[PDB]
Design a protein around this ligand. Structure first.
Ligand SMILES: Nc1ncnc2c1ncn2[C@@H]1O[C@H](CSCC[C@H](N)C(=O)O)[C@@H](O)[C@H]1O
Lengths: 321, 237
RNA sequence: GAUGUGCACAUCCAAAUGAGGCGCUGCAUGUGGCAGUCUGCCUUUCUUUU
């Protein structure tokens, strides 16, 4: 019967969620067990999980499914379920029993692995890492076999299969070799280098630019304004139609606003010199932006990316020279 | 993606295996010759040329700055051949470090010659094209004409061919393989500018063989030897 | 890469990744950072079969 099969699936999912494996690995449901008196949880909590939704939404049919069951028990009403066998420390032998497998066909399913490995041994727990929540298998899996002999059997039975300890040793060897190569090249770059209150308030340096079209990027505006006078800052929001420029001397701002040929005819811009209250509010905005950028913590950049970018730039420089 | 840049078809394999093209070309022009390569995405062709034919120098050039990073990943993949699980090489990176030359060192050893530069080859102004100087001996421009054509019109396409005329030294040749006219219409609705410049096309892929012979560019003679493969020669000395 | 119509038109899908997690300095800094810190460290990972 199909109802019999649904009762069996509810029994298997509850006996897995209460098996030793998932209780050792998962922390959430173990906190649900631990943060109770007499070690219980309501079945309505178990309904809310994702794989329970595909089977049944009735809790009494779940309680009927847990009548004949190895490790779960019911207390009075068929609304709460307890572990029935007390749990202790994590086993040490599971780290030796664990099996790493590679080259998955990218169709990842828990039943997929259970079919292909269940004949070899009693598969107890599966780990499949999703592509950063994009619902895609990364291409490798961790399958845990029971009693540590069936795992050694399944290694011999087989698409690339190895132990956990061998994987950890290859990981340490890989990481040490990369550290040695980067240390030597770090020394080579060092030897090549060895052988070879903020801005002052000035009145009349604030040019506000208004545009009908959306403005081009800050590199484009900086290349436009720098070719005429000396620019200190380009205040430009991405997507805004207006911007500001702060210059070193007021003569620079005068040379920019009197550059009607190079600016206003090429780009449909209205550039004026702010003064008075607009300039005071803009310099207060400069103070706020400076205090904000100071109060912000420093951005993080990985050391290996910074070192490989420096080496790539020196490679281009020494090839062009 | 607008320019035609594909992050796909990544190659684990070393130069021994290539993506088809290299049985067609003849190695006689490459050896001891400075080479520019336009429209390279991961250099799976660039590395596999530089690996055997031993070109003296080879500068790949591409617009997608995100993708030249993966090309440099592929160049560091060859040095670290000194099995390892793919789950680790995906997350860490390749073992080797980016091979930097000493000041007193021997070039033309694979890979020490090649470098990958990111830039835009269409300068959009004829005055900037006329200022340029010849620097290279063989220029490869294959499977590029369609995307530059639809993105910058006959104006940018004329600018690119006039720039390729300015960067060949005397005796330097050009290799070409253009996309046919029948293809372009399946890509017209990607953006607005592609559609507008597609309905502003006045130049067919056939008259390329006319237009490069025309004095506005200045190539002297040409041939086709077996999409077709065109070889253009600048006039000798 | 696929679908309808009679190679042509029209439509659909393109994303075969790498920079993902977390710091310490000591100088600068609305200047959009610079030089170090064991390749700065770690990656079965920004995972809910909770
Ligand atoms: N304006 C431009 N100048 C130079 N290269 C460009 C360009 N616009 C697009 N390209 C590049 O041209 C490439 C064409 S893909 C062609 C395949 C490549 N030649 C190979 O053999 O593997 C794209 O990757 C794109 O990045």
């Amino acid at each position: 019967s199909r109802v019999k099969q649904v009762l069996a699936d509810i029994a298997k999912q509850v006996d897995f969620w209460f098996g030793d494996a998932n209780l050792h690995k998962d922390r959430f449901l173990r906190e649900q067990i631990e943060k109770s008196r007499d070690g219980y949880v309501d079945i309505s909590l178990l309904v809310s999980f994702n794989k329970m939704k595909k089977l049944t939404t009735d809790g009494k049919l779940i309680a009927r499914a847990l009548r004949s069951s190895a490790v779960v028990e019911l207390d009075l009403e068929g609304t709460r379920i307890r572990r029935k066998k007390p749990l202790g420390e994590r086993p040490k032998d599971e780290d030796e029993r664990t099996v790493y497998v590679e080259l998955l066909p990218k169709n990842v399913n828990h039943s997929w692995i259970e079919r292909v490995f269940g004949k070899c041994g009693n598969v107890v727990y599966i780990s499949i890492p999703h592509y950063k929540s994009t619902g895609d298998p990364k291409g490798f899996a961790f399958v845990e076999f029971e009693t540590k002999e069936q795992a050694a059997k399944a290694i011999e039975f087989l698409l690339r299969v190895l132990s956990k300890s061998e994987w950890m040793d290859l990981k340490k060897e890989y990481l040490a070799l990369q550290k040695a190569s980067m240390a030597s090249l770090k020394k080579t770059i060092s030897q090549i280098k060895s052988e070879s209150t903020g801005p002052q308030f000035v009145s009349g340096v604030i040019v506000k630019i208004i545009s009908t079209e959306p403005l081009p990027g800050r590199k484009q505006v900086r290349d436009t304004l720098a070719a005429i006078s000396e620019v200190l800052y380009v205040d430009l929001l991405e997507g805004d139609t207006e911007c500001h420029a702060r210059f070193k001397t007021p003569e620079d701002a005068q040379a920019v606003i009197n550059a009607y040929t190079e600016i206003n005819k090429k780009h449909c811009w209205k550039l004026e010199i702010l003064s008075g209250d607009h300039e005071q509010r803009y310099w207060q905005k400069i103070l706020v932006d400076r205090q904000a950028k100071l109060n912000q913590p420093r951005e993080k950049k990985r050391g290996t990316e910074k070192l490989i970018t420096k080496a790539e730039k020196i490679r281009l420089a020494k090839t062009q020279q | 993606f607008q320019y035609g840049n594909y992050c796909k078809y990544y190659g684990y394999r070393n130069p021994s295996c290539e993506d088809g093209r290299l049985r067609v070309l003849k190695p006689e022009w490459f050896r001891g010759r400075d080479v520019l390569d336009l429209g390279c995405n991961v250099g799976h062709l660039t590395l596999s040329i530089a690996c055997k034919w031993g070109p003296s120098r080879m500068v790949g050039l591409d617009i997608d700055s995100r993708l030249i990073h993966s090309a440099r990943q592929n160049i560091r993949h060859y040095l670290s051949e000194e099995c390892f699980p793919a789950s680790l090489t995906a997350s860490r990176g390749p073992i080797a470090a980016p091979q930097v030359p000493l000041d007193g060192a021997d070039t033309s050893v694979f890979p020490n010659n090649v470098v990958f530069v990111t830039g835009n080859y269409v300068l959009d102004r004829d005055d900037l094209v006329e200022a340029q100087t010849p620097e290279y001996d063989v220029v490869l421009c294959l499977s590029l004409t369609k995307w530059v054509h639809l993105n910058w019109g006959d104006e940018g396409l004329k600018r690119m061919f006039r720039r390729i005329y300015r960067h060949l030294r005397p005796g330097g040749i050009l290799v070409l393989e253009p996309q046919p006219w029948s293809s372009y219409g399946k890509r017209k609705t990607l953006t607005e500018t592609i559609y507008k410049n597609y309905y502003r096309i006045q130049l067919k892929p056939e008259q390329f063989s006319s237009y490069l012979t025309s004095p506005d560019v200045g190539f002297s003679s040409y041939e086709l030897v077996a999409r077709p493969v065109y070889l253009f020669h600048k006039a000798r000395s």
